[PDB]
Amino acid sequence: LIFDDCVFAFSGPVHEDAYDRSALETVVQDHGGLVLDTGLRPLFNDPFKSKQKKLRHLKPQKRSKSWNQAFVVSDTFSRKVKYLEALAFNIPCVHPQFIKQCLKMNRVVDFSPYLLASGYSHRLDCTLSQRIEPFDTTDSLYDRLLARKGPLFGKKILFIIPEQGQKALAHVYHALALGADVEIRPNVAHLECDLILTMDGTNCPVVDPEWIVECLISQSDIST
Amino acid sequence: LIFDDCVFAFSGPVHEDAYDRSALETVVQDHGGLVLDTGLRPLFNDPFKKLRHLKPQKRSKSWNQAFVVSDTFSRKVKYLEALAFNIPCVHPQFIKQCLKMNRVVDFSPYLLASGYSHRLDCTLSQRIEPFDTTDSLYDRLLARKGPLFGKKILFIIPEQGQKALAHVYHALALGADVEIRPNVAHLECDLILTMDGNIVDETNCPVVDPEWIVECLISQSDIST
Ligand SMILES: [Pr+3]
Ligand SMILES: [Pr+3]
Ligand SMILES: [Pr+3]
């Protein structure tokens, strides 16, 4: 079975019917690949399980020891949920043509020729490339994700939060996935800080969620 | 000098005034960098002297990093060249960041998309072999085997054929072994290139558009496989 130990999530399509999701999901399943309908989040522990307000960066979930390859499929680059998560996790976003090429070769070929742009940077006004650590035939996804420290690793972020609340949680989730620790508060309260995030309600300094996306698209700490 | 061991080519801007090229060219020179006005070709021999793939010139032993700078991806000849050689095409901000840090930083956060695939109908990523600080550009370029390494390609091509030569060059940079004859039809081969002439009737290998070369450049792969 070609897709043995591979996890797939499917994003978009961005443009109507640029690819047949259901057909491809079926082909993947029929070949030993697991399909995650909601996306890559099940690879990690739910940070919001405790409904806590001071959060540590994400840790790989037990179940991800069971796989060694992951991919998000997309007709082109986007800012949809599954896409950003993948960017956050350093999991390759690839063109559907990858799956078809795997079938054609009766194996899992190198995904690079099908590796989409990471996204469009408004700050830089260009499309950037994804930068993917190669899959090691030695590690499970659990090893890979455990050993990964994202571009925001170490950084301590204060997210100030007095429908819209879920939007905030998503930004927090991305910051955690990039390796930052995040404390959710209503005020700075004179707290020590590396960086402060608001949806836009005094010594860090401050920045909005677009900053997070730039970090996601560029896989860097752009405040640098 | 920060850029003492870096070679830079500059392309575009692609969009009017996206960046101040002359200002950037000046600052790189002021900071020790070599600027190649015509692009990256001077780093290799002149193959058009049925020659085999490109070899780096001894000159390139004197530098260990190279970049093509551009506001965004394009199909300009300098860009296409960088793609063929696996030299990073980066955003101008890269230079400003180096100045800011007083060192040559990781170019990675400034790594532009490789290009738009009309075949896949999407924008793809560049994939660059990391610069090993112990290796010169010569070592780097000598060790490289493009995605077209091995492929025998026939360029039937009987001022304007300069645009043609550009394609020939990219195939070689991609590591192909190329022979150029006005027409076939014996002959060897595993691929045939014609710039929309038509190509003779019967043939032993599929006919290909230059776009096929561009697709190989943008995806860094052998596409007909
Ligand atoms: Pr030196
Ligand atoms: Pr102009
Ligand atoms: Pr102008």
Curated annotation (Swiss-Prot), chain A:
User: In the UniProt annotation, what is the result of changing C126R?
Assistant: Disrupts dimer formation, but not gamma-H2A binding
Please summarize what the entry says happens upon disruption of the gene.
Not resistant to the microtubule depolymerizing drug thiabendazole (TBZ). DNA damage sensitive in response to ionizing radiation (IR), ultraviolet (UV), hydroxyurea (HU) and camptothecin (CPT).
* Residue stretches making up the BRCT domain: 1-116
Cystine pairs annotated here are: none
Which function does this protein serve? Essential for cell cycle arrest at the G1 and G2 stages following DNA damage by X-, and UV-irradiation, or inactivation of DNA ligase. Plays a role in the response to DNA damage. Interaction with rad4 via its phosphorylation sites in the N-terminus couples the DNA checkpoint apparatus to chromatin via interaction of its C-terminal BRCT domains with epigenetic modifications on histones H4 and H2A, respectively, in the G1/S phase of the cell cycle, and facilitates recruitment of the checkpoint kinase chk1.
Q: Whom does it interact with, and what assembly results?
A: Homodimer. Dimerization is mediated via the BRCT domain. Interacts (via BRCT domain) with rad3. Interacts (via Tudor domain) with histone H4K20me2. Interacts (via BRCT dmain) with histone H2AS128ph (gamma-H2A). Interacts with chk1. Interacts with sad1.
Q: Where in the cell is it found?
A: Nucleus
Q: What is the effect of changing K80E?
A: Disrupts gamma-H2A binding, but has no effect on dimer formation
> How does the record comment on the protein's domains?
The Tudor-like region mediates binding to H4K20me2.
In its UniProt entry, what is this protein called? DNA repair protein crb2
Q: Which organism is it from?
A: Schizosaccharomyces pombe (strain 972 / ATCC 24843)
